[PDB]
Each structure stands twice: as structure tokens, then as C-alpha cells.
Design a protein around this ligand. Sequence first.
Ligand SMILES: CCCCN[C@H]1C[C@](O)(CO)[C@@H](O)[C@H](O)[C@H]1O
Ligand SMILES: [Ca+2]
Ligand SMILES: [Ca+2]
Lengths: 83, 851
Amino acid sequence: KPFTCLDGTATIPFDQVNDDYCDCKDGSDEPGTAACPNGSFHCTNTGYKPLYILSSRVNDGVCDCCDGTDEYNSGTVCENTCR
Amino acid sequence: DRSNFKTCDESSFCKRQRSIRPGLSPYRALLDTLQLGPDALTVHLIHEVTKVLLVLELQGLQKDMTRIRIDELEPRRPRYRVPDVLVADPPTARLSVSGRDDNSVELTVAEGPYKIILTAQPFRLDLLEDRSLLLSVNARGLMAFEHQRAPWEETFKTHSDSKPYGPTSVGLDFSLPGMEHVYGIPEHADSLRLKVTEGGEPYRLYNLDVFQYELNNPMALYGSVPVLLAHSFHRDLGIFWLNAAETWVDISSNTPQTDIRWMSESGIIDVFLMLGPSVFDVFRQYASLTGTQALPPLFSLGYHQSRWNYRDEADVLEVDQGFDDHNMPCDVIWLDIEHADGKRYFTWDPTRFPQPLNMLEHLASKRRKLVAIVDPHIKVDSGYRVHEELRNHGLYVKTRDGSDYEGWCWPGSASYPDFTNPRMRAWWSNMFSFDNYEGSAPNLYVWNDMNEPSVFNGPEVTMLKDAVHYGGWEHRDIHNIYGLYVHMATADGLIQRSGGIERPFVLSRAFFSGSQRFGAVWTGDNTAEWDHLKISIPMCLSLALVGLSFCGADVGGFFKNPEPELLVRWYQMGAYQPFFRAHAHLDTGRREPWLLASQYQDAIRDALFQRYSLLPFWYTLFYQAHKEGFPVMRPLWVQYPEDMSTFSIEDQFMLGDALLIHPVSDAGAHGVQVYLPGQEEVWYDIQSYQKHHGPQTLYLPVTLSSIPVFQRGGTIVPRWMRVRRSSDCMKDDPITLFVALSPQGTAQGELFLDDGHTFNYQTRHEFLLRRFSFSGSTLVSSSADPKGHLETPIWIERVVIMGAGKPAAVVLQTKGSPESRLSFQHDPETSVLILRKPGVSVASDWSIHLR
Ligand SMILES: CCCCN[C@H]1C[C@](O)(CO)[C@@H](O)[C@H](O)[C@H]1O
Ligand SMILES: [Ca+2]
Ligand SMILES: [Ca+2]
């Protein structure tokens, strides 16, 4: 099946979810990347409070989440500090 | 308070020179003494009354330039010749005697078309292309050369100039037939098109610290570039008066013709005539003499947050966090003089900045930089190691009795290192090593202020004329390059500390011809008022024309508190100017951009996002400035030399040839009048995508968030649409290309890429220069310089085409890949075509076809 933007603006093939290009006006098709200006990246942050961050801070080379999962392809290795 | 500063009448050499009025010159060339040499023609000149003998050295130069030098035949003492400003000995062209009579010798440069006519009596020079007169020298007979007499004493207010060499001033006039518009000779808080000086003061070039300077007047400010450009419908010319002493410039209009007269306190006459014919020819001619804009590290083209002063390390970190908490980008936070130990530079206040390395480490973890101020005045303090070293090694500027000069500045009593001494500059450069400048780190950069030099208890708030420098030269001989030497030694220090790898960033207040090689400048202590916002355009445009492309003004104004609307408009203005820094006086209220009401915050954030989105475009323009000498920010007349209605415009400007900017600069404005030039030219409003045909004056309604910006048809602008918290975060991100189609359905653009901060682009050719071109129905990416290769993940995520119809299909071809189909979106109202995710590496050749 295809994916539908949560705001109903479009329906796209599921291979355009997290394909590093913003296809949904609400940013819902790119929860795991920095592609959308209004998106959010969810940090589970086990051992502390889970956090939402701006999509623009995914792989920006800055450690935003204590669990470090926002930096997975940036050259910055973030140690886990959720303690 | 202007009684602090001499008018021409209160300057005895300006009074003497300016009293000489247009008439029959007493100088005469002795044609019996003429010698035609390998690089030059020399001929003796004589003053008919005084019988003083001078030598004229006349040279044709490669790239259609002429150099005129005049010195005494038998000087009692050597005259000053400006060192370190020319980047090379200019390659010469052979002169030939191609005509002669009783009173004249005609010279040909190489094999033509340029000719120089030397008239013997009265002495005169005329410059021609073929039979067209370009320029005359001494046509009004204003040449004056005060020779060195047997070794006057002068006082101004409470300061005494011993003037041990007496009157030594030099001057010369130039006639520009057909020219009605002249520009340049910064720095003055005055209009772009220079005014006639006939009924008032001459323009003054003497690097001075003017407290609360006022607008629309010819008083000398902090920097001096003795370069004048002349523009007409038919031709462009430039005059480069290579003199480092106090200089006054008279301008008179008289078939239309403009006469220029330079009057300098000492040194020789040394002037370059740059014959164009186009203004870009003039840019190249001047760049070959004094060099080009240093390529800024990318971060320094982002947004700088500054004030006098941030309180301590905690304040600095709070400001850093404030940007991220309010979703506003920023690359650098600045530390003004209160960060040091009582204005002892290279130190840190032990209570408020106890751990600078840890503060710099925290900023590096946000991928941000810091700038620390380092001024050239050194506190007289036996516990201050810098002062003890400079004192012990005799590296200070001296007085005539041989003691070290002492004046007053920020730390109280202070001495001034002799930056004209190469041993002093090497010492200064070595002081920036990470072992010497303790607490500094690779993400700390430098601001040189007060380097005119500013001397609080000195005449005109600067150093005494009869202070003595390296080689025995007087301060009056060298004054206008003192600041440049500070800028240069600081920039060299930032390079050396890295082992020669990192590009520097240094902001300087004082400057001279050649300062473009060492970093950025700004217009000093402006005021939080609407007219100071307006004047930032003509001031930075006058700097751009003379090679200083890395220019800006304090956003919000340095003095006083701007109202929120003025601050919003200043952010919008600054976001489209080369050096983009907010700064403020010690006693102003805090005005970090999130402290405003949300509507003002939002407009400012929008301006910051636009600036960061445009960094690839800015970086390419600076690469083009670095390689070719073309200015980044440009008057409309540079792009439209035949449209006479642009010759004085200074409320509008262009960035390269692609973007026309008209920032709102009036409180409560409901619209602006935008002049869109060019016959058969179209312009795209980048907010609405509406196309407009030139030439017209368009009335455009505005709101608080409006920044009137238009993209020229025929251009392709690269943008990073993923705005992040700093430029370092963005430098691997994909590019969106904005193609604005000409009426012929064409466009072209370039893009420069490298590691963002080293000299590897130069030493290893590690860079990319791409050409993007559109014609027919095909967009092509090719190499504009095959020597450049770069490892980069940057790819093309989007193409936006303005002025295009709906295609039936879109097809991408890239070498190494199968042909692919691209999806797309089209707006019939705006004729805007968006091509989705080409996905091709920016280092790859590729083409997109609209079928
Ligand atoms: C009343 C102060 C006048 C001089 N201002 C200079 C010094 C300083 O104020 C502090 O270093 C800087 O903030 C300005 O930017 C400089 O131009
Ligand atoms: Ca997607
Ligand atoms: Ca991050």
C-alpha cells in the first residue's frame, strides 16, 4: 500500500518515506531524516525523557539526543548520556 | 565635536596646495634629458621659477595601464614609496617614440592603440586610445612638488608637530573628458556618486577614529582607499593614487568633464591610470596591482552575533543556547574588550573568562565559532608580558628622542607596536600560536579594532605626525597603511598557527588599498537610526568598487537603541550585505533577536533563513571575487553601464548579476519603488514568482516581513533549502537550483565548493566549480574548471524553474547511470516548474530534459 501524508495533501509510494526528500507539507514522510523544514525526529532516549527535535538537527553533527540517535550518518559519534 | 578634526584650511599643506588655482603650470619637461629605457621613459622636469629639478618615470603596463612616478632629481633625503601594497612588480609594456615636435613627444604603448603625449612646456600628459583623448594630467596646471629644503613647526589645538623636514607635499590634477560621475575613495559617510568639492571641503583620506560620525559629509573616517572610478555611457576609467600620507581629493565638474586633484603630505607622486574600457576591465586592472579579496572561510559569511560586551562564559553559552531554543541560525559569537584582563590583549579576565578552552570546546560542540578582539595598542605595564617583550626587543613606535611612544587608549597609558617593521609583524603573527595565545583554539578568530591607530590624547585622536618608525620614516609618511599592517600580521598569525592550512578570518576597522587580501572591514561606529541604515548601501558599494568586497555595517546601529521595526529592517538589509554582524555599544539595551515580540522575531528569523539558504551563492560570488577581482555587491550601473538613470542609485544594489535587492529603509512604509533595469530583461519576484519586464519602476507593496528581492532572467542561483543552526552543519547538504529563464528561454550559473575552511582548494586543487546552463529545453551541469576535484556527498535535491511551461515528461541523464524519469509539479498561474529529487552528485556531469 502507499503512504498518505497526515494532512492529506498527498499520497506517495512508500519508497518515498525517509527517502531524504520532503514530499509532505507537514513533513510526515521524513520522520528519520533532515529533509523537511517542519518535521520532527523522535528520540526514544531510554533512561531519560524521550524528546522531539527539529528535523533540521538530524545529522547536523551536533548531539541533540542523549541517546545519540540523531547522529547516525554525520561523522559525529555521540556517546549515550541519558543517565 | 568637529573642532577636533582639521579642515583643509587648518592643515597647512592642504592650505598651501589648495591655494594653487588652475593656471599656467611652471613645470616644464627638458626633452634633452629624455631616456627611453627597458621598462620606462625618464625625463627631467624643472620648475621654471625655483629651478627645482624632478624626474618623471613614465611606464606603459601590461593590461592597458599607465604608471606615472615623479621624484626629486637630487633629494637631500629619500622620499617615501609605499611598500607591501602592490602584490607584484607590475609587468611593463614597451614605449616607443612615434611622434615628435619642438614642444611634444608622442609615445606608443607596445603596438597600440594606446598613446601618451608628453607636452614639454607647460608640462602635460594626454592619454589616447587611437585618436580619442581618454585623460589628461596637469591640464589645469595644478602640479605642486614641495622639495626637501635644508632642515615647518606647526601646532593644532594642544599638539605640536615638530615637522623636522618642513613642507614636502605633492599634488597633481587629472582631467576626465566625457565623465560626469565619479565614485570610490572610501571611507566617507557620503553618497555613492561623489560630489563636487568646489564650494566646500575636499574629500579627506586619513584613517581617523571619529566619535558619533555624521552623515553626508566629507570628513575622513577609519579607512582610506585612494582609488577613484569614473563612469560614463561610453567608457570606464580608474585612478589609483599610491600614497600612504594624509591625502585630500578635490573634485570639480565643468563637453561634460570632471577634474580630479590629489594632494598628499609627503611621499612621491605615484599614480596608476587604469584605462578600462569596461568597469570589469578596471576591476581586473586594479586587482592585478593590489590583489583580490581573500576567500572567506564559509562560516564567516554566516550571521555574527556581537555586542560590547557579553558578560562571561555563562552569558556566551546562554546566547548560544538562545539561538537554538528560538530556531535562529548563527555561526559566530563575538567577545569585545571586556573579555580580556583590563584591556591587556591576548589575555582573559580571570573571573568572567577563567576557562576559555572549555568555552571554545562548548561552542565547537555546537559547530560554532568565537571572535576575540585584539587591538594594536599595548598597555604600559611591567607585569604584562606582551609589553615587556615589545619593549625589550625595541619593537615599539618611537619618538624623536628615541624613547617608546606612549599615548592613551582603552587600558590607559599604552604603547604602539611598529607594524611597519617586518620583525614586529613576524612577532605579532607568532603571538597567535596556540602556545603563545593561551586559551585560544582553532575555532577562535580575531577582530582588529582601533588600528588607525586610535590615540585618545593624540592630535585628531591619532598618533603624532613626527613619531618615528622602522627605517627612520615619520608617522606622517606611513599613516594610512598602519592599520593594513595590523590586519595583515593578524591574518598571517591565524594561518601560521594552523601550520599554513586554515584560512583566516580577521575583521579590521582601518584599511588601505590591498586590505581585501586580509579579510573583512566594517563601517565602524554607526548609529541606530533610519538614515544610518540607508547609508550602509552607498558606503559598502564605494568599498566594493575599490576591491573591498567583504564589507558591512553594524546591524541595529552601534550607538543608541533601535526601535523594533528599525531592527527588523536592519536584519533584512544586513542579511543581503557581505559582512553580516549585529553589534552594539556598552550602554545599549540587549537586543539579541529573540528578545523582541514574536512578530519581530519571525521577520528576523525569516531574514536569517534567507541568508543561510543563499550561502552557496554567496560563497561562489566570493570565489569569483577571489579569482577575478569582481565585486560581490554591485551598483546597478556596473551591470547596466548604458542606463544613465542608474548612475546614482544607492537605495538598491545587485549581488553579482543575478539578484537585485531593494531593502525597506523607511519606518511604516507601505511600499517601495523598485527600478528594474535592462531592455528586453525580465525579473522574478522571488517571493511571489511574478515576472516583471524591464525597464520600469515598479511600485511594490510591503509588510514587515518583506525583503524586495528579484532574480534576473538568464541566471541560476544555488541554495541550501535545509537551514540548520550554523553553516558548518550545512556544508554536506544537497543543493536546490533556482533557474530564472531569460526571454530567450536560457539561463546560466556557477557553483563553487570546497572543504569550507582550508587552503586545499589552492594547494591541492580540492574544490569543485560547476557550470549550470539551460537552453532549448535542457538543463546541463558541466565542469567550469576541470582541475578541481572534491570528495563531497553534496547532491542536487531539487530544481526550480521560473518562467517555464508544463512538460509532458522530465528525463535525467548522468554519466554512469541509466536514464531516469523525474516527477514534477507545475503551477500554471506562476509558470513555476519544480523537478523532484534529481538525486545526482554535484561532482557529476548530468542533463535534465523537458520533453
Ligand atoms: C564609545 C566607543 C567608541 C569606539 N568603538 C570601538 C571600540 C568598541 O566600542 C569596544 O572595543 C567596539 O565595540 C566598537 O565596535 C569599536 O568601533
Ligand atoms: Ca520523501
Ligand atoms: Ca543533531
